Design a protein around this ligand. Structure first.
Ligand code: 3FU
Lengths: 11, 204
């Protein structure tokens, strides 16, 4: 599969 | 050039996505607003009026408050905005406001291409990812029976010779996977494999 990047987004 | 929305809707359904699938849209997909259920979609980088340019897959896992964005090419948001004029910030905001109590979500995206630079199989790789997402929503990107079939390569290497053998093998294993799971793909195989060809952008 693919390597991924996890980012937290707050609104 | 590429897969139509009817093609993708039929394959996604065939893959066992239908109950969690919100449809195929253009760049104006509003987001995950309805309810806090396992949900996914296929979204185009462009508006319907331009005729369509590139396909992306979006998933929502409510047990982790994660929005998965799958670009078969693993371009960063910055590169998606540059190459395709596509931004999905408003989508993420509308979604986190509608479904997250803390108004926060986790955005998980690929950094690796599974697709050759001249290929038009983007819509089809999106179908494969959504199959992996509906069956393993806690880890759809890799480490699951469906995505373990493909080999991601660093996005930065997209235009390099050393990776075409890998990106072609991905495209062949994509077809094999879809032929195994989708009667619609089997029925329209010759027209699908030809219009989404590994070399299709050079054969325009
Ligand atoms: C993948 N690498 C790749 N390669 C070439 C073209 C494409 C994108 N293909 C499309 O967008 C299709 N267009 C449509 O299906 C349809 C459409 C539907 C929706 Cl829901 C949104 C948009 Cl923006 C467009 N068109 C006909 C209005 C192709 C069949 C046409 C280029 N992906």
């Amino acid at each position: 599969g693919v390597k991924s990047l996890k980012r937290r987004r707050c609104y | 050039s590429g897969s139509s929305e009817q093609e993708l809707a039929a394959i996604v359904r065939d893959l066992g996505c239908g109950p969690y699938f919100l449809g195929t849209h253009d760049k104006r997909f509003p987001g995950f607003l309805a309810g806090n259920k396992l949900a996914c979609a296929i979204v185009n980088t462009a508006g319907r009026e331009t005729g369509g340019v590139h396909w992306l897959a979006f998933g929502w896992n409510p047990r982790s408050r994660t929005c998965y964005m799958f670009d078969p090419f693993g371009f960063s948001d910055r590169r998606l905005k540059q190459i395709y004029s596509f931004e999905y910030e408003a989508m993420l905001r509308r979604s986190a406001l509608a479904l997250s109590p803390d108004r926060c979500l986790s955005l998980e995206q690929s950094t690796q291409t599974v697709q050759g630079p001249d290929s038009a199989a983007c819509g089809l790789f999106c179908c494969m990812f959504l199959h992996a997402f509906v069956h393993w929503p806690d880890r759809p990107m890799d480490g699951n029976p469906t995505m373990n079939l493909l080999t991601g390569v660093p996005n930065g290497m997209l235009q390099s010779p050393q990776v075409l053998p890998t990106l072609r093998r991905n495209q062949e294993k994509l077809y094999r996977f879809l032929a195994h799971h989708s009667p619609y793909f089997r029925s329209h195989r010759a027209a699908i494999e030809h219009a989404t060809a590994f070399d299709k952008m050079k054969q325009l």
